[PDB]
């Protein structure tokens, strides 16, 4: 219903209305103040309000999925990381770049680990360099290839700037399982795709 209704309504959009939509997604990645808003667990970034800076990309609040098939993982995407957010699907760390992808660009895609309710990113610790995921936009799905796992502490936001030379998205979410004092960061570089 999520992802299905985002690419239904995807397969509609005029393309010229795409076109109007990608010239204002480009021009917030090229002058991005690439600063991470915070670490979505903590208390002032659970509470945020309604995110509304990516509302070009956006299909009924959905900017997009990501799609992991190793996993059978396929999440819509909100902007944000707000409470509500994480609740419905995975939230864009804002700060980093929209996922529209190109040189020089690092979009983050958050996720829970261990809900109850749904299993959301809890499985990306089973995933391993080389596996690849792809992130669905309105314009159309990039390929990404996993080139390094790591474990941070929550308030080290090193790993998730841009790296001038690279487009990089990193899928970030708690870890150890069930003990959620440090972030499992997935980073994979952008390969190209031919649908």
């Given at each position: 219903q999520q992802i299905a209704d985002f690419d239904k309504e995807k397969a509609t959009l005029d393309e010229a209305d795409i076109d109007e939509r990608m010239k204002l997604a480009q021009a917030f990645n090229d002058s991005l103040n690439n600063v991470v808003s915070g670490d979505p667990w903590s208390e002032e970034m659970k509470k945020k309000?309604?995110?509304?800076?990516?509302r070009m990309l956006e299909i009924h609040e959905r900017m997009g999925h990501v799609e992991i098939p190793v996993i059978d993982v396929d999440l819509p995407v909100y902007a944000g990381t707000a409470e509500e957010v994480l609740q419905q699907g995975a939230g864009h760390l804002e700060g980093t770049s929209l996922?529209?992808?190109?040189?020089?660009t690092h979009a983050v895609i958050t996720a829970h680990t261990g809900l109850p309710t749904a299993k959301m990113?809890?499985?990306?610790?089973?995933?391993?360099?080389g596996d690849k995921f792809y992130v669905h936009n309105i314009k159309e799905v990039m390929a990404y290839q996993v080139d390094q796992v790591k474990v941070i502490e929550p308030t080290n936001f090193d790993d998730l700037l841009i790296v001038p030379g690279h487009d990089y998205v990193t899928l970030l979410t708690c870890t150890p399982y069930m003990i959620n004092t440090h972030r499992l960061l997935v980073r994979g570089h952008r390969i190209p795709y031919v649908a």
């Open positions: 309000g309604r995110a509304e800076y990516a996922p529209i992808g190109g040189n020089s990113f809890t499985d990306l610790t089973k995933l391993k360099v």
